[PDB]
Design a protein around this ligand. Structure first.
Ligand SMILES: OC[C@H]1O[C@H](O)[C@H](O)[C@@H](O)[C@@H]1O
Ligand SMILES: OC[C@H]1O[C@H](O)[C@H](O)[C@@H](O)[C@@H]1O
Ligand SMILES: OC[C@H]1O[C@H](O)[C@H](O)[C@@H](O)[C@@H]1O
Ligand SMILES: OC[C@H]1O[C@H](O)[C@H](O)[C@@H](O)[C@@H]1O
Ligand SMILES: [Mg+2]
Ligand SMILES: [Mg+2]
Ligand SMILES: [Mg+2]
Ligand SMILES: [Mg+2]
Ligand SMILES: [Mg+2]
Ligand SMILES: [Mg+2]
Ligand SMILES: [Mg+2]
Ligand SMILES: [Mg+2]
Ligand SMILES: [Mg+2]
Ligand SMILES: [Mg+2]
Ligand SMILES: [Mg+2]
Ligand SMILES: [Mg+2]
Lengths: 386, 386, 386, 386
């Protein structure tokens, strides 16, 4: 009954189940988790692996010797459990020095510090076996219009990612970068606020093939956008390197609910797309167990993330395999959408009187698309009424 | 007192002052305007030129002879008034045949028809002197998840724009294309919903240099995004070919208020950016005089668009020229944001102990950014309290 | 398999399945339906009854003799089919005379006309057997701040509803009024924009017992609000006289999708609440079959409204009847929420040292609420995984 | 030049200028302020008074003797400076015991504790001279649908406010209560989420005359609502007891920007309304100086709150006093909106053939409202272009 195994490639950030529940209006409701106990507990639930920020694993300000001890204990738990570390990232947002950003801070010395802090953790990530290095520029942005010249900030952002790409290529590392967009919070507006803006920015980097996106369900929904559409565009561009799964109820603060909560139909269409397209990266949950919960609730919430993915996977597979749905997809001309408009070429199209001079515009207009019957078949499959 | 002249390059769509006031819940409140009278009235107000959809100028279904008469009358009014036509576009959204899209309709014959309808109007646009051809894919999208495979739809969208680029290059035309994003309305979600998604898509076309964006104030605000930030990214990429100016009060239906209404501070920062960056294209108003208004109100509303641009231009210029603001920009380190993070290069950065090992993180963190004083100087300038 | 019968009390507006598909950007895609054929088709699908605006049934401008013929034909179809008319309403929004409102138009003569048009249809409604008369003030509002003094407008709104209440009481009619809120569209902001504002306004009418609310799923969601919470508050006040069921994907234009589309979890919690609370009014669908659809799609969409209600009803009933859920509700202390905080009274509470001086705040804080396990049981029931 | 004096009645919460800058993603950037130094600094800037939560003034867990010392020092600074304390409130949101609410927590013992904590601070408030006691139920709400039965929660909320009203009347205190709505954050949905819902709830309390609202600019804007419209409805009901002034850029997390930032036109129409209606309560700023700022920025930000109010007051007064605006208001029939629709009564309206049978609907429909000219006069006044 919907039991995960490590082959499902479910992964969790240390900061997810370890969130202590401090929010803008309230103190922590849970004690801190040791990363070693999170790894053990997640392995028991069926997870494949964990991810981390540098500062989740090594307390900020640690001496090089305390650092080695923290890494050794962590590596021992990975060996003991079989858990992998597919992705890592840098905390460029918690310490007050990053209050105006890391890569795009107005102060040049902070930007240099931000790059050195990142590069140190790239070495550690490679050593732990990570394939993807995520950058979430949560402090890159502004509350007021005069504080940030955005063209200069984008030059600084391009400069930072170009330098990181020079670093990994000169070291020979097999790691790729993924930019995680978010439209706002904690800054009033964040630079590269959606999947689209991040994809466009990547095309201006010196080595675009090293960079992709790490979209998050709740972040695109904070702009009211359709998250499966945005993932489709990332897949179309070949840039979906990693994904953050969670839930969000509309346009408000980033809730980071467990996956399947929030917009359930969008979760169904997301799973349908990822499975149909053969996405083979980690299914990573970036979620926060609500601060109402004790530790039993934390693990129930994490298990629910995986359960809901596996239920939706089953329902989406049943939908696509149902002959009556295959019939309806042809009734709605999804087959014709996949065929070229004009494989015959421009001159043939210009000479084709059936495309214009003799096109019967009223007969074409009268054809129904039959989309409502198709969508009700999808609803019936989701709810298990088929 | 803030009087426009044709050198300000203000332009209006025929469909703006000609909107009859039909909305989803109500009949028209104004009679139809003859395009010739709109051209004459706009020239009297100080406009530089007009834009059109094919179907605004030539009623749909016109014979080739009625078509020539419509164009001759229009050209005569342009000659009489001195008005230019800098941009044109195609109506691929009103006729029922486009109910599921034009370039990405599921029916292949509609997609071919959509391309032939576009190509016919490109010839007319070039003949009238337009430099920019806009595409707004208002029907390209979906209300439900199974109706549109977005990767196939993006293939069809790329196919259509590639064919249009082949057409203009084979004819030798000096015209460029601008894609106008919108996140929703009239479809539940529209493909390429923001500036960012459109910029990313352009990079996958065969001839990307022929394509840019035509962002609209109200459209990016329907996603809650910061419109001057999005324009900055378009300028940074070199792709701001045209712009649609209007106002919008937040995340709701597309209001198309006169420019300066809606988010007034964002309008100030937009004007500051366009003028500082030297944008030299048309200042185009895509707005709808509210249906409460009679014809005197229509022309008052159009005049207000231009007036508010010129007031904001004056206030933004006074802001940037004020020595006390120049001082505050340096106090907030805008000068340092414009300098390279690491012109000394990667190896120098890695060896620079002042960037990490000896960086005083607490002293850097204590420095205030002084952004609130800067923003209050900007408020004082906007309100004329300086 | 989820077949409606007239005992389920499903009702539809004539304007729903009869929507021709004209939107702000496009012409009609469907021909007009005769009201008599809509009644017959809805009866075949299992509906209980229909609702109407005056102008849906009697074309605007009809002579008193054409009016009688329209009503006779309609009454004959009701007799032939067994369909009831539980609710009626007035169109105070389509005709250009209502461009600035009906009850709160600035022009006094329009406000008087609006009241006479309403009163004429109240007589017809009573004659057809309606129990509820709905008022949706779609044009009452403003696009700009100086156009409407809202305190004077609320005086005029109170004046109009007080007069309508005087009319029904002086005639002896057994009909009640329900105000339908909406936050925006077609006006930039609409007066009484949410359930809450409407409930508060009712308390200032001369005869508050005659007035309740008719909330619409999609309208409260256009403000980002939780629609089952708002219905709970209306039930708590005793004012849920009628309800409009449909679906909406977030904060954007009013989509009026079929019920069950949009926010599916909110639809589940809404059905759970209506059924638990014993709401016994009509389950009315105010939805628009998308303009992609032909007539077969219209009836498929209407049938889907009813199907999804009946599936969600079954899942919510299974959820509430499941012993494991009953256990979890007690684990989360829903039983204690229903008990009085201080039935012992104020003085006892002030003397109770266990409520403050000796209250163990750290032990109470450590108790988890177990809400995530409860919510995953609800997800499992919704998806049929229990 | 726009200098505040204590007669302007500007007040600030201790928690505003004292916010240390801890947000969900980052540590504090500023040290804690002693309340005595905040009082002195605010008095120098021209403030009238301060407000507090119990826990801002008396650290949580203080002994009754430490409590007296904290109050004595505070009272000494009030005496030294002339500052008043017009409002106070209770912190029922920071401590983990309130993680599921205070008055509507599912655990009965927490609800009792919440009431005793409130009652203790009401005594202190009265002793310091406060006239208004605010309740913001920031934790009253839910992230999931099954966690809170909202009808039972509203019973508990009514029970708590009824008990507080019994307490103040039995003690003879001259203090009134004001409920502060907020739609979300930190709970996924908060009960009584808008001005309207709070006004409706007040009408079901045992002693409604003791309760009003304390609306906050940014909170109603987090639902996309028109804040001056909501204030107008509160004034119309006689319930605007207090107000929280700040700025917010659209639907997102609660930004609490300084007043005048965010939606500047809405701030102008708000000031116009408060001054026209003669609101005579405190002009209270509930804002957070951004965490980019040091202490000089904090005081600059607080001063900006007051400056922008006084500039907008001057511009709104000039607008209303301008003969050309008075002419335009009559052109738009604002005078007619203020006159009764039917002072002649129901029977006269029914007999008045000029209201229906002989009403010329086409002539009334053709009259323009002239709202765009009126709104451009308001824009010109705001920008100082008149
Ligand atoms: O950068 C990795 C993670 O960092 C932060 O915790 C963000 O809130 C989360 O969205 C992101 O994925
Ligand atoms: O395509 C040009 C214009 O077409 C339509 O009228 C749109 O509503 C407008 O946004 C667009 O700019
Ligand atoms: O007034 C009854 C109906 O009228 C209009 O058609 C509205 O769009 C709908 O929401 C409302 O319920
Ligand atoms: O309750 C008084 C204050 O408490 C909290 O600090 C809230 O965030 C603020 O909105 C409210 O006004
Ligand atoms: Mg998130
Ligand atoms: Mg996130
Ligand atoms: Mg994330
Ligand atoms: Mg628009
Ligand atoms: Mg537009
Ligand atoms: Mg446009
Ligand atoms: Mg609706
Ligand atoms: Mg509706
Ligand atoms: Mg409705
Ligand atoms: Mg706030
Ligand atoms: Mg607040
Ligand atoms: Mg507040």
């Amino acid at each position: 009954n919907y039991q995960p195994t490590p082959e499902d490639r479910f992964t969790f950030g240390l900061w997810t189940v370890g969130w202590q529940g401090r929010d803008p209006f309230g103190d922590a409701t849970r004690r801190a988790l040791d990363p070693v106990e999170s790894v053990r507990r997640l392995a028991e639930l069926g997870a494949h692996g964990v991810t981390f920020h540098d500062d989740d694993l090594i307390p900020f300000g640690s001496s090089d010797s305390e650092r080695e001890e923290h890494v050794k204990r962590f590596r021992q738990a990975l060996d003991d459990t079989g858990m992998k570390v597919p992705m890592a990232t840098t905390n460029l947002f918690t310490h007050p020095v990053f209050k105006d950003g890391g890569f795009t801070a107005n102060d040049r010395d902070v930007r240099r510090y931000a790059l050195r802090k990142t590069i140190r953790n790239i070495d550690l990530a490679v050593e732990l076996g990570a394939e993807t290095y995520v950058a979430w520029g949560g402090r890159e942005g502004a509350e007021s219009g005069g504080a940030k010249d955005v063209r200069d900030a984008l030059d600084r952002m391009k400069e930072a990612f170009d330098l990181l790409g020079e670093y990994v290529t000169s070291q020979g590392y097999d790691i790729r970068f993924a930019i995680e967009p978010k439209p706002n919070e904690p800054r009033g507006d964040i630079l590269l606020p959606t999947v689209g803006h991040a994809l466009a920015f990547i095309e201006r980097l010196e080595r675009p093939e090293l960079y992709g996106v790490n979209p998050e369900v709740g972040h695109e929904q904070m702009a009211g956008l359709n998250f499966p559409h945005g993932i489709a565009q990332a897949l179309w561009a070949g840039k979906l390197f990693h994904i953050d799964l969670n839930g969000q109820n509309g346009i408000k603060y980033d809730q980071d609910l467990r996956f399947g909560a929030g917009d359930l139909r969008a979760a169904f269409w997301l799973v349908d797309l990822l499975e149909s397209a053969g996405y083979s990266g980690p299914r990573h949950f970036d979620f926060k167990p609500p601060r109402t919960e004790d530790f039993d609730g934390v693990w129930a919430s994490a298990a629910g993330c995986m359960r809901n993915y596996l239920i939706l996977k089953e329902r989406a597979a049943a939908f696509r395999a149902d002959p009556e749905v295959q019939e309806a997809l042809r009734a709605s001309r999804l087959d014709e959408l996949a065929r070229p408009t004009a494989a015959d070429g421009l001159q043939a199209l210009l000479d084709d009187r059936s495309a214009f001079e003799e096109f019967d515009v009223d007969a074409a207009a009268a054809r129904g698309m039959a989309f409502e019957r198709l969508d009700q078949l999808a609803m019936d499959h989701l709810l298990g009424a088929r």
